[PDB]
């Protein structure tokens, strides 16, 4: 304990602390609901509690923020970024002081987007104030006779920044000292100057040896991928499309297999083989493998499908992976439980490219006893769309799920197909899960993605892992909604459990969207409303302005909530009864409730019992 580490090329004494261990209970192992082999761990490298800072280091953090350091930011630092080098180059040409116009023609026009955000790095100090005149190189004899001569503020700012004095700026500001005492350097790519002539930033970073997300990706790309690679990088959207990996070369080898399996060139079947650029002499990882595509929306590869995947066993063959491309792109109901069930007992990779137009996750993989699991749930479209859902039990014994190849961002043009992993944010249980009218199996899956596996980066979605993902799981993201639109028995949240074993040390989970099975113009709920859960449904609530959503499979059932049985409703019964309108955009037409003609009719605001549509 109390070792020394080089934070910024300079050795400093630090409170480096042990990385947490993910405690896996025997209930997780005995219910078959842990990750199946070598439990995944999020923080592969240490946190820093504090660095005992010294002037020798906080000086270098300024020299780095000014110069661009000597790493990834070495070219967008505060006094050698791209815009500042276009001015400092032109100002060294011999032209008279009127030449600021030639830099004005370089801050509008095609450069207009790049100057406005790079100017703002200085403009938080460079504005009209008495303090700036100390921070020019030697121009104290050139500024106060020139203020009235610039033809616009967009000239005067350029003549400012081209003549700031680098050796004056060696001072870190207060907020970026506390982040350095926590062990983080300023990132030169976002450093900016404040009014007192001192440096802070919109962004920081740890030293790379202690960088959690870079060390997680540098491990997961090395072990879990089947086709491993050494970098922290995501795959590019076109490497996702072309079935190709960093450090691997892909051969199409289809035509020799076409001689054996009678598929013609147009059919939407290809074989490819991946081999490494350098083979690895070690045991236990592939030096080559096969990827078979099945472009199922071509039709020919959907007729020639189930028989093919099994022919590719009985020929005496050992395929590493499959690319079920364009699932549903030509007709939305397209069935797959037979084809996706046809696979071996061990699978290394699956690329399932779902259609955005289908949104149809038929992926009940039916417990293929292990996947070494480059199980990737990719799409050719809007991968954040709130209609995406997955069955959690369908992943039970897959060792990893692809959540590194996330590519979607604001850049891409309208007319080209991006490709990315899905941000799954809802769970879709299906009709065989609620087996004999008991919640036993749904409480394995609904504990799987909320506790037993909730330190893996896939069982998380649109908040990622939080602070200490292996020890305070209550802080992590989780899939924020339930879809029961395919399991006809479930009328409510009854018998579902959302805190595991130690209810103080992790937050009880909550949900935000709930879709329920329904078919007729009404929805009928009977008397489970006394034991149905309210406190599960409040939308990540701190006193939240927004509301949860409740939906139905048929989207138009306005008539009423219908109610049956002898039982008179308790205090909690009125609470749960209100939540079926309060959260229910399909049904906020005046709170109408049809109690059947039997029993007391004990309420004020409730209807007769007849329900025929006019």
Coordinates of C-alpha atoms in Angstrom, one line a residue:
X1 CA 0.0 0.0 0.0
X2 CA 1.1 3.7 -0.6
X3 CA 3.1 2.9 -3.8
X4 CA 4.4 5.6 -6.3
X5 CA 2.9 6.0 -9.8
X6 CA 3.9 8.2 -12.8
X7 CA 0.6 10.3 -13.3
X8 CA 2.1 12.8 -15.9
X9 CA 5.6 11.5 -16.7
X10 CA 6.4 12.4 -13.0
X11 CA 6.5 9.9 -10.1
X12 CA 4.1 10.8 -7.2
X13 CA 3.0 9.0 -4.0
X14 CA -0.7 7.7 -4.2
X15 CA -3.5 6.0 -2.2
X16 CA -3.9 3.2 -4.9
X17 CA -6.6 0.9 -3.6
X18 CA -7.6 -2.8 -4.4
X19 CA -10.1 -3.4 -7.3
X20 CA -13.4 -4.9 -5.9
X21 CA -14.2 -8.7 -6.3
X22 CA -17.7 -9.6 -7.7
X23 CA -19.3 -11.7 -4.9
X24 CA -21.2 -14.6 -6.6
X25 CA -23.6 -16.5 -4.1
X26 CA -24.4 -20.2 -4.1
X27 CA -28.0 -19.2 -5.0
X28 CA -26.6 -17.8 -8.3
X29 CA -24.7 -21.0 -9.1
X30 CA -27.4 -23.5 -7.9
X31 CA -30.3 -21.7 -9.7
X32 CA -28.2 -21.9 -12.9
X33 CA -28.3 -18.1 -13.2
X34 CA -24.7 -16.8 -12.7
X35 CA -22.6 -16.3 -15.9
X36 CA -21.6 -20.0 -16.6
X37 CA -17.8 -20.0 -16.7
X38 CA -15.1 -17.7 -15.2
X39 CA -17.4 -14.9 -13.7
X40 CA -17.0 -11.6 -15.6
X41 CA -15.5 -8.6 -13.7
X42 CA -15.8 -4.9 -14.6
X43 CA -12.9 -3.0 -12.9
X44 CA -9.9 -5.0 -14.2
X45 CA -7.5 -2.3 -12.7
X46 CA -7.2 -0.1 -9.6
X47 CA -9.0 3.1 -8.6
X48 CA -7.0 6.0 -7.0
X49 CA -8.4 7.4 -3.7
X50 CA -6.0 10.4 -3.7
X51 CA -2.6 11.4 -5.2
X52 CA -0.4 13.4 -2.8
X53 CA 0.1 16.2 -5.4
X54 CA 3.3 18.4 -5.6
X55 CA 4.2 21.7 -7.6
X56 CA 6.5 19.5 -9.8
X57 CA 3.4 17.6 -11.1
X58 CA 0.8 20.4 -11.3
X59 CA 3.3 22.4 -13.4
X60 CA 3.5 19.5 -15.9
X61 CA -0.3 19.2 -16.1
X62 CA -0.2 22.8 -17.5
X63 CA 2.7 22.1 -19.8
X64 CA 0.7 19.2 -21.2
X65 CA -2.6 21.2 -21.5
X66 CA -0.6 23.9 -23.5
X67 CA 1.6 21.6 -25.7
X68 CA -1.0 18.8 -26.3
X69 CA 1.0 16.5 -24.0
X70 CA 2.7 13.7 -25.9
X71 CA -0.2 11.1 -26.3
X72 CA -3.5 11.1 -28.2
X73 CA -4.1 14.9 -27.7
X74 CA -0.6 15.8 -29.2
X75 CA -2.1 18.0 -31.9
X76 CA -5.3 19.6 -30.3
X77 CA -3.7 21.2 -27.2
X78 CA -4.4 24.8 -26.3
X79 CA -1.4 26.4 -28.2
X80 CA -0.8 23.9 -31.0
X81 CA -4.3 22.9 -32.3
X82 CA -5.3 23.0 -36.0
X83 CA -6.9 26.5 -36.0
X84 CA -4.2 28.1 -33.9
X85 CA -1.5 26.7 -36.3
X86 CA -3.3 28.3 -39.3
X87 CA -3.0 31.7 -37.6
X88 CA 0.5 31.3 -36.2
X89 CA 1.7 30.2 -39.7
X90 CA 0.1 33.1 -41.6
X91 CA 1.3 35.7 -39.0
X92 CA 5.0 34.6 -39.8
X93 CA 4.4 35.6 -43.5
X94 CA 5.9 39.1 -44.0
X95 CA 2.6 40.8 -44.9
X96 CA 1.5 44.1 -43.3
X97 CA -0.9 44.3 -40.3
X98 CA -3.9 44.6 -42.7
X99 CA -3.5 40.8 -43.4
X100 CA -6.1 39.8 -40.6
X101 CA -8.6 39.9 -43.5
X102 CA -6.8 36.8 -45.0
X103 CA -7.5 35.0 -41.6
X104 CA -11.1 36.3 -41.6
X105 CA -11.6 34.5 -45.0
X106 CA -10.4 31.5 -43.0
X107 CA -12.9 31.7 -40.0
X108 CA -16.1 32.0 -42.0
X109 CA -16.9 29.9 -45.1
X110 CA -15.8 26.2 -45.0
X111 CA -13.9 26.7 -41.7
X112 CA -17.0 28.3 -39.9
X113 CA -17.7 25.1 -37.8
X114 CA -14.1 24.6 -36.6
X115 CA -13.2 28.2 -35.6
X116 CA -16.4 28.9 -33.5
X117 CA -15.7 25.9 -31.1
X118 CA -11.9 26.5 -31.0
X119 CA -12.3 30.3 -30.4
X120 CA -14.5 29.4 -27.3
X121 CA -11.4 27.8 -25.7
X122 CA -9.9 31.3 -25.5
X123 CA -13.1 33.5 -25.4
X124 CA -13.8 32.5 -21.7
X125 CA -10.7 34.8 -21.0
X126 CA -10.1 36.7 -24.2
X127 CA -13.2 39.0 -23.8
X128 CA -13.0 42.8 -23.0
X129 CA -11.2 42.9 -19.6
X130 CA -8.2 44.6 -17.9
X131 CA -6.4 41.1 -17.2
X132 CA -5.7 40.1 -20.9
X133 CA -2.9 42.7 -21.6
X134 CA -0.5 40.8 -19.3
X135 CA -0.8 37.5 -21.4
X136 CA 0.4 38.8 -24.8
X137 CA 4.0 37.8 -25.9
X138 CA 5.4 41.3 -26.2
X139 CA 2.4 43.2 -27.8
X140 CA 1.9 45.6 -24.8
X141 CA 3.3 48.2 -27.2
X142 CA 0.9 47.1 -30.1
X143 CA -2.5 46.5 -28.5
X144 CA -3.7 49.8 -26.9
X145 CA -3.0 51.8 -30.1
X146 CA -4.9 49.2 -32.3
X147 CA -8.2 48.5 -30.5
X148 CA -10.2 51.0 -32.7
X149 CA -8.5 49.8 -36.0
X150 CA -9.9 46.2 -36.4
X151 CA -12.9 46.1 -38.8
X152 CA -14.8 43.6 -36.5
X153 CA -14.4 41.5 -33.3
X154 CA -13.6 38.4 -35.6
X155 CA -10.4 40.2 -36.6
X156 CA -9.4 41.4 -33.1
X157 CA -9.8 37.9 -31.6
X158 CA -7.4 36.4 -34.2
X159 CA -4.8 39.1 -33.6
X160 CA -5.2 38.2 -29.9
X161 CA -4.8 34.4 -30.0
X162 CA -1.9 34.5 -32.6
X163 CA 0.1 36.5 -29.9
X164 CA -0.7 35.0 -26.5
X165 CA 2.4 34.3 -24.2
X166 CA 2.8 30.5 -23.5
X167 CA 5.1 30.8 -20.4
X168 CA 2.4 32.9 -18.5
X169 CA -0.2 30.1 -18.5
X170 CA 1.5 27.6 -16.2
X171 CA -1.3 27.7 -13.5
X172 CA -4.0 25.0 -12.9
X173 CA -7.4 26.4 -11.7
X174 CA -9.2 25.3 -8.5
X175 CA -11.7 22.8 -10.0
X176 CA -8.9 21.0 -12.0
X177 CA -6.8 20.8 -8.8
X178 CA -9.5 18.7 -7.0
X179 CA -9.7 16.4 -10.0
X180 CA -5.9 16.1 -9.9
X181 CA -6.0 15.3 -6.1
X182 CA -8.4 12.5 -7.2
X183 CA -5.7 11.3 -9.6
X184 CA -6.9 12.8 -13.0
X185 CA -4.9 15.0 -15.5
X186 CA -6.5 17.7 -17.7
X187 CA -7.0 16.4 -21.3
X188 CA -5.3 18.9 -23.7
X189 CA -8.2 18.2 -26.2
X190 CA -10.6 20.2 -24.0
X191 CA -8.4 22.6 -21.9
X192 CA -9.6 26.2 -21.9
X193 CA -8.5 29.5 -20.2
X194 CA -10.5 31.2 -17.5
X195 CA -10.6 35.0 -16.7
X196 CA -7.7 34.8 -14.1
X197 CA -5.2 33.6 -16.8
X198 CA -5.3 30.0 -15.6
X199 CA -6.3 26.5 -17.0
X200 CA -9.3 24.2 -16.5
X201 CA -11.3 21.9 -18.8
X202 CA -14.6 20.5 -19.9
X203 CA -12.8 17.1 -19.6
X204 CA -10.1 15.0 -17.8
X205 CA -8.7 11.5 -17.9
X206 CA -6.8 9.0 -15.6
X207 CA -3.3 7.7 -16.5
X208 CA -3.8 4.8 -19.1
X209 CA -2.7 2.1 -16.6
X210 CA -5.7 3.1 -14.3
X211 CA -8.3 3.9 -17.1
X212 CA -11.4 1.7 -16.4
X213 CA -13.2 1.8 -19.8
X214 CA -9.9 1.5 -21.8
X215 CA -8.7 -1.5 -19.6
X216 CA -12.2 -3.2 -19.8
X217 CA -12.2 -2.9 -23.6
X218 CA -8.5 -3.9 -23.9
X219 CA -9.4 -7.1 -21.9
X220 CA -12.8 -7.9 -23.5
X221 CA -11.4 -7.5 -27.0
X222 CA -8.5 -9.9 -26.0
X223 CA -10.5 -12.8 -24.4
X224 CA -14.3 -12.9 -25.1
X225 CA -14.5 -12.1 -28.8
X226 CA -13.5 -15.5 -30.4
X227 CA -11.7 -13.5 -33.1
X228 CA -9.7 -11.5 -30.5
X229 CA -7.7 -8.2 -31.1
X230 CA -5.4 -6.2 -28.8
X231 CA -6.8 -2.6 -29.0
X232 CA -9.4 -0.8 -26.8
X233 CA -11.2 0.2 -30.1
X234 CA -14.8 -0.7 -31.1
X235 CA -15.1 -2.2 -34.6
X236 CA -16.0 0.3 -37.4
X237 CA -19.5 0.1 -38.8
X238 CA -18.2 -1.2 -42.2
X239 CA -16.0 -4.0 -40.5
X240 CA -19.3 -5.0 -38.7
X241 CA -21.0 -5.2 -42.1
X242 CA -18.1 -7.0 -43.9
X243 CA -17.7 -9.7 -41.2
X244 CA -14.0 -8.7 -40.7
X245 CA -11.8 -8.0 -37.5
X246 CA -8.8 -5.9 -36.6
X247 CA -5.7 -8.2 -37.0
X248 CA -7.6 -10.8 -39.1
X249 CA -7.9 -11.4 -42.9
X250 CA -11.1 -12.9 -44.4
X251 CA -11.2 -15.2 -47.4
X252 CA -14.4 -16.1 -49.2
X253 CA -14.2 -19.9 -49.7
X254 CA -17.8 -20.5 -50.9
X255 CA -17.4 -22.2 -54.3
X256 CA -15.7 -25.5 -53.0
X257 CA -18.6 -25.7 -50.5
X258 CA -21.1 -24.9 -53.3
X259 CA -19.8 -28.2 -55.0
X260 CA -20.8 -30.2 -51.8
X261 CA -24.0 -28.4 -50.7
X262 CA -25.7 -27.5 -54.1
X263 CA -26.4 -23.8 -53.3
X264 CA -26.1 -21.5 -56.5
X265 CA -24.2 -18.2 -56.5
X266 CA -27.4 -16.0 -56.1
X267 CA -28.8 -18.0 -53.1
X268 CA -27.6 -15.7 -50.2
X269 CA -25.2 -18.3 -48.6
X270 CA -21.4 -17.5 -48.4
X271 CA -18.6 -19.3 -46.6
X272 CA -15.7 -17.2 -45.3
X273 CA -12.6 -18.2 -43.3
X274 CA -10.8 -15.9 -40.9
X275 CA -7.0 -16.4 -40.3
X276 CA -4.8 -14.1 -38.1
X277 CA -2.0 -12.0 -39.7
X278 CA 0.4 -13.5 -37.0
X279 CA -0.6 -17.0 -35.7
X280 CA -0.5 -17.4 -31.9
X281 CA 1.6 -20.5 -30.7
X282 CA -0.5 -20.7 -27.4
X283 CA -3.2 -23.3 -26.6
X284 CA -6.9 -22.5 -26.1
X285 CA -7.6 -19.8 -28.8
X286 CA -8.3 -20.1 -32.6
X287 CA -5.6 -19.6 -35.3
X288 CA -8.3 -19.9 -38.0
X289 CA -12.1 -20.4 -38.2
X290 CA -15.3 -20.4 -40.4
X291 CA -18.1 -17.9 -40.7
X292 CA -21.3 -18.9 -42.6
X293 CA -23.7 -16.2 -43.7
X294 CA -27.4 -16.8 -44.2
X295 CA -29.0 -13.7 -45.8
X296 CA -32.5 -14.9 -44.8
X297 CA -34.6 -12.2 -46.5
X298 CA -33.3 -13.4 -49.9
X299 CA -35.8 -16.3 -49.6
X300 CA -33.4 -19.0 -51.1
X301 CA -31.3 -19.0 -47.9
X302 CA -34.5 -19.2 -45.8
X303 CA -35.8 -22.4 -47.7
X304 CA -32.2 -23.7 -47.7
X305 CA -31.6 -23.0 -43.9
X306 CA -32.5 -25.6 -41.2
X307 CA -31.4 -28.5 -43.3
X308 CA -28.2 -26.6 -44.2
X309 CA -27.1 -25.8 -40.5
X310 CA -27.6 -29.5 -39.7
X311 CA -25.9 -30.7 -43.0
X312 CA -23.0 -28.6 -41.7
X313 CA -22.9 -31.0 -38.8
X314 CA -23.4 -34.4 -40.4
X315 CA -20.8 -33.8 -43.3
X316 CA -18.2 -34.0 -40.4
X317 CA -17.8 -30.3 -39.9
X318 CA -17.1 -27.8 -37.0
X319 CA -18.3 -24.2 -38.0
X320 CA -17.1 -21.5 -35.6
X321 CA -19.9 -18.9 -36.4
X322 CA -23.0 -17.8 -38.2
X323 CA -24.3 -14.5 -39.8
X324 CA -28.1 -14.6 -39.8
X325 CA -28.3 -11.4 -42.0
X326 CA -31.4 -9.2 -42.6
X327 CA -33.8 -11.0 -40.2
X328 CA -37.3 -9.8 -41.2
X329 CA -36.3 -7.2 -43.8
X330 CA -38.9 -8.5 -46.4
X331 CA -41.8 -9.7 -44.3
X332 CA -42.3 -8.9 -40.5
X333 CA -43.7 -12.2 -39.1
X334 CA -40.7 -14.3 -40.4
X335 CA -40.3 -17.4 -38.1
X336 CA -36.8 -18.5 -36.7
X337 CA -37.2 -20.7 -33.6
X338 CA -36.4 -23.8 -35.8
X339 CA -33.5 -22.3 -37.8
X340 CA -31.9 -20.5 -34.8
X341 CA -32.6 -23.7 -32.8
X342 CA -30.7 -25.9 -35.4
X343 CA -27.3 -24.8 -34.1
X344 CA -24.7 -27.1 -32.4
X345 CA -24.3 -27.5 -28.5
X346 CA -21.2 -25.2 -28.6
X347 CA -21.3 -22.0 -30.6
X348 CA -18.5 -19.4 -30.7
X349 CA -20.1 -16.5 -32.7
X350 CA -23.6 -15.4 -33.8
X351 CA -24.2 -12.3 -35.8
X352 CA -28.0 -11.7 -35.7
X353 CA -28.7 -8.6 -37.9
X354 CA -32.3 -7.7 -37.0
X355 CA -34.4 -5.5 -39.2
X356 CA -35.5 -2.1 -37.7
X357 CA -38.7 -2.6 -39.9
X358 CA -39.4 -6.0 -38.2
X359 CA -38.1 -5.2 -34.6
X360 CA -38.9 -8.9 -34.1
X361 CA -36.6 -10.6 -31.5
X362 CA -37.6 -14.3 -31.9
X363 CA -34.2 -15.2 -30.3
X364 CA -35.3 -18.0 -27.9
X365 CA -31.9 -19.7 -28.3
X366 CA -33.2 -22.5 -26.0
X367 CA -30.2 -23.0 -23.8
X368 CA -27.4 -24.1 -26.2
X369 CA -25.3 -25.6 -23.4
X370 CA -22.4 -23.1 -23.8
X371 CA -21.6 -20.2 -26.1
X372 CA -18.0 -18.9 -25.9
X373 CA -20.3 -16.2 -27.2
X374 CA -19.4 -13.5 -29.6
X375 CA -23.3 -13.4 -29.5
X376 CA -23.9 -10.1 -31.3
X377 CA -27.3 -8.5 -31.6
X378 CA -26.7 -6.1 -34.5
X379 CA -29.0 -3.9 -36.6
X380 CA -29.1 -2.1 -40.0
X381 CA -31.1 0.9 -38.6
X382 CA -32.3 2.7 -35.5
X383 CA -30.7 0.7 -32.7
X384 CA -32.1 2.9 -29.8
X385 CA -35.8 2.4 -30.9
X386 CA -38.0 1.7 -27.8
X387 CA -39.6 -1.4 -29.5
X388 CA -36.3 -3.5 -29.1
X389 CA -36.7 -6.2 -26.5
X390 CA -35.0 -9.6 -25.6
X391 CA -35.9 -12.6 -23.5
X392 CA -33.4 -12.7 -20.6
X393 CA -33.7 -16.4 -20.0
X394 CA -32.6 -17.0 -23.7
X395 CA -29.0 -15.7 -22.7
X396 CA -28.7 -17.9 -19.5
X397 CA -25.5 -19.8 -20.4
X398 CA -23.8 -17.5 -23.0
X399 CA -20.5 -16.2 -21.6
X400 CA -20.5 -12.7 -23.2
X401 CA -22.8 -10.5 -25.4
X402 CA -21.5 -7.9 -27.8
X403 CA -21.6 -4.5 -26.3
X404 CA -18.3 -3.0 -27.6
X405 CA -19.3 -2.6 -31.3
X406 CA -21.6 0.4 -30.6
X407 CA -21.3 2.8 -33.6
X408 CA -24.4 5.1 -33.8
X409 CA -23.7 8.8 -33.5
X410 CA -24.8 12.2 -35.0
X411 CA -22.3 12.2 -38.0
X412 CA -23.8 9.8 -40.5
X413 CA -25.6 11.0 -43.7
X414 CA -29.3 10.1 -44.4
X415 CA -28.9 7.8 -47.4
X416 CA -26.4 5.0 -46.1
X417 CA -27.0 2.0 -43.8
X418 CA -25.0 2.3 -40.6
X419 CA -24.7 -0.9 -38.5
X420 CA -24.4 -1.2 -34.7
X421 CA -25.1 -3.2 -31.6
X422 CA -28.6 -2.6 -30.2
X423 CA -29.2 -0.6 -27.0
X424 CA -31.7 -3.1 -25.5
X425 CA -33.9 -1.4 -22.9
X426 CA -36.8 -3.8 -22.4
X427 CA -37.3 -7.5 -21.5
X428 CA -39.6 -9.8 -23.4
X429 CA -40.7 -12.9 -21.6
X430 CA -42.7 -15.4 -23.7
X431 CA -45.6 -17.9 -23.4
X432 CA -43.5 -20.9 -22.3
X433 CA -41.8 -19.0 -19.4
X434 CA -44.9 -18.6 -17.2
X435 CA -45.0 -22.4 -17.3
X436 CA -47.6 -23.9 -14.9
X437 CA -49.1 -20.5 -13.7
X438 CA -46.1 -19.9 -11.3
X439 CA -43.5 -17.1 -11.4
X440 CA -40.5 -19.4 -10.5
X441 CA -38.8 -19.2 -14.0
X442 CA -39.5 -15.5 -14.5
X443 CA -37.8 -14.7 -11.1
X444 CA -34.6 -16.4 -12.4
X445 CA -34.5 -14.3 -15.6
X446 CA -35.7 -11.1 -13.8
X447 CA -32.9 -11.6 -11.2
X448 CA -30.3 -12.5 -13.9
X449 CA -30.4 -9.1 -15.6
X450 CA -31.0 -7.1 -12.4
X451 CA -28.4 -8.7 -10.0
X452 CA -26.6 -12.0 -10.9
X453 CA -25.2 -10.8 -14.2
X454 CA -25.8 -7.0 -13.8
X455 CA -22.0 -6.2 -13.8
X456 CA -21.6 -7.3 -17.5
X457 CA -21.9 -4.3 -19.8
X458 CA -24.8 -5.8 -21.9
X459 CA -27.4 -6.3 -19.1
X460 CA -27.3 -2.6 -18.6
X461 CA -28.2 -0.3 -21.6
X462 CA -28.5 3.5 -21.7
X463 CA -26.6 4.4 -18.4
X464 CA -23.8 1.8 -18.6
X465 CA -21.8 0.6 -15.5
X466 CA -21.7 3.3 -12.7
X467 CA -18.9 3.7 -10.1
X468 CA -18.0 0.4 -8.5
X469 CA -20.0 -2.1 -10.7
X470 CA -18.7 -5.2 -8.9
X471 CA -19.7 -4.1 -5.4
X472 CA -22.6 -1.5 -5.5
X473 CA -24.7 -3.2 -8.3
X474 CA -27.7 -1.0 -7.2
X475 CA -26.0 2.0 -8.9
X476 CA -25.6 0.2 -12.3
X477 CA -27.9 0.5 -15.3
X478 CA -30.4 -2.2 -16.1
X479 CA -33.1 -2.7 -18.8
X480 CA -35.7 -0.2 -17.8
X481 CA -38.9 -1.9 -19.0
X482 CA -41.0 -5.1 -19.3
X483 CA -42.8 -6.4 -22.4
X484 CA -45.4 -9.1 -21.7
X485 CA -47.1 -8.7 -25.2
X486 CA -46.5 -12.4 -26.0
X487 CA -47.4 -14.1 -22.6
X488 CA -51.2 -14.1 -22.2
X489 CA -51.4 -15.1 -18.5
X490 CA -49.6 -12.1 -17.0
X491 CA -52.2 -9.4 -16.0
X492 CA -50.0 -7.5 -13.4
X493 CA -46.8 -7.4 -11.5
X494 CA -47.6 -10.0 -8.8
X495 CA -45.0 -12.4 -7.4
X496 CA -42.1 -10.7 -9.3
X497 CA -39.2 -9.8 -6.9
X498 CA -36.7 -6.9 -7.4
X499 CA -34.3 -7.0 -4.4
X500 CA -32.2 -10.1 -4.0
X501 CA -30.8 -11.2 -0.6
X502 CA -29.2 -8.1 1.1
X503 CA -31.8 -5.3 0.6
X504 CA -29.8 -2.4 2.3
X505 CA -26.5 -2.7 0.2
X506 CA -28.2 -2.6 -3.2
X507 CA -31.1 -0.3 -4.3
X508 CA -34.4 -2.2 -5.0
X509 CA -34.8 -2.0 -8.8
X510 CA -37.6 0.0 -10.6
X511 CA -39.2 -0.1 -14.1
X512 CA -40.5 2.7 -16.5
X513 CA -42.5 0.9 -19.2
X514 CA -44.8 -2.1 -19.0
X515 CA -46.6 -3.7 -22.0
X516 CA -49.4 -6.2 -21.1
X517 CA -51.2 -8.9 -23.3
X518 CA -54.7 -7.8 -24.4
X519 CA -57.1 -8.6 -27.3
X520 CA -60.7 -7.2 -26.9
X521 CA -61.9 -3.5 -26.6
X522 CA -61.5 -3.7 -22.8
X523 CA -58.9 -5.2 -20.4
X524 CA -60.0 -7.5 -17.6
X525 CA -58.0 -7.8 -14.3
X526 CA -60.1 -9.4 -11.6
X527 CA -58.8 -9.4 -7.9
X528 CA -55.0 -9.6 -8.0
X529 CA -55.0 -5.8 -7.4
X530 CA -54.6 -6.4 -3.6
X531 CA -51.1 -8.1 -4.0
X532 CA -49.9 -6.4 -7.2
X533 CA -46.9 -4.1 -6.8
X534 CA -47.0 -0.3 -7.0
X535 CA -43.4 0.6 -5.7
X536 CA -41.9 -1.4 -8.6
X537 CA -43.3 1.0 -11.2
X538 CA -42.2 4.5 -10.2
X539 CA -40.0 5.9 -13.0
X540 CA -36.4 5.9 -11.6
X541 CA -38.1 8.2 -9.1
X542 CA -36.5 11.0 -7.0
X543 CA -39.8 12.9 -7.2
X544 CA -39.5 12.7 -11.0
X545 CA -41.6 15.1 -13.3
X546 CA -42.3 12.4 -16.0
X547 CA -44.6 9.4 -15.8
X548 CA -44.2 5.6 -16.4
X549 CA -46.0 4.1 -19.5
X550 CA -48.4 1.1 -19.6
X551 CA -49.3 -0.3 -23.0
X552 CA -51.4 -3.1 -24.6
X553 CA -50.8 -5.5 -27.5
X554 CA -53.9 -4.2 -29.4
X555 CA -53.3 -0.4 -28.8
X556 CA -57.0 0.7 -28.7
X557 CA -58.8 -0.9 -25.7
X558 CA -60.3 2.3 -24.2
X559 CA -63.6 0.8 -23.0
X560 CA -62.8 0.2 -19.2
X561 CA -60.7 -1.7 -16.8
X562 CA -63.1 -4.7 -16.1
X563 CA -63.2 -6.2 -12.5
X564 CA -64.4 -9.6 -11.2
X565 CA -64.7 -11.8 -8.0
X566 CA -66.3 -11.3 -4.6
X567 CA -63.4 -9.4 -2.9
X568 CA -63.8 -5.8 -1.6
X569 CA -60.7 -3.6 -2.4
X570 CA -58.4 -2.4 0.4
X571 CA -56.4 1.0 0.6
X572 CA -53.6 -0.5 -1.5
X573 CA -56.3 -1.8 -3.9
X574 CA -57.3 1.8 -4.7
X575 CA -53.6 2.7 -5.2
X576 CA -53.0 -0.1 -7.8
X577 CA -56.4 0.6 -9.5
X578 CA -55.4 4.2 -10.1
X579 CA -52.0 3.2 -11.7
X580 CA -53.9 1.5 -14.6
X581 CA -55.1 5.0 -15.7
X582 CA -52.4 7.4 -14.3
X583 CA -49.7 5.7 -16.5
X584 CA -51.9 4.5 -19.4
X585 CA -52.1 6.8 -22.4
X586 CA -54.4 4.3 -24.3
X587 CA -57.0 4.6 -21.4
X588 CA -57.0 8.2 -19.9
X589 CA -60.7 8.7 -21.0
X590 CA -62.2 9.6 -17.6
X591 CA -61.1 6.6 -15.4
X592 CA -64.0 4.2 -16.4
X593 CA -64.2 0.8 -14.5
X594 CA -66.7 -2.0 -15.2
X595 CA -67.3 -4.1 -12.1
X596 CA -69.3 -7.3 -13.1
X597 CA -73.0 -7.3 -11.9
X598 CA -72.1 -9.7 -9.1
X599 CA -71.2 -8.5 -5.5
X600 CA -71.7 -5.2 -3.6
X601 CA -71.1 -2.4 -6.2
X602 CA -69.5 -0.6 -3.2
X603 CA -67.8 2.3 -5.2
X604 CA -69.1 5.7 -6.4
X605 CA -67.2 6.2 -9.8
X606 CA -67.9 2.7 -11.4
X607 CA -70.2 1.2 -14.1
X608 CA -73.0 -1.4 -14.6
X609 CA -71.4 -4.6 -15.9
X610 CA -72.6 -4.6 -19.6
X611 CA -69.9 -3.9 -22.2
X612 CA -71.1 -4.4 -25.8
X613 CA -69.4 -2.1 -28.5
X614 CA -71.8 0.2 -30.4

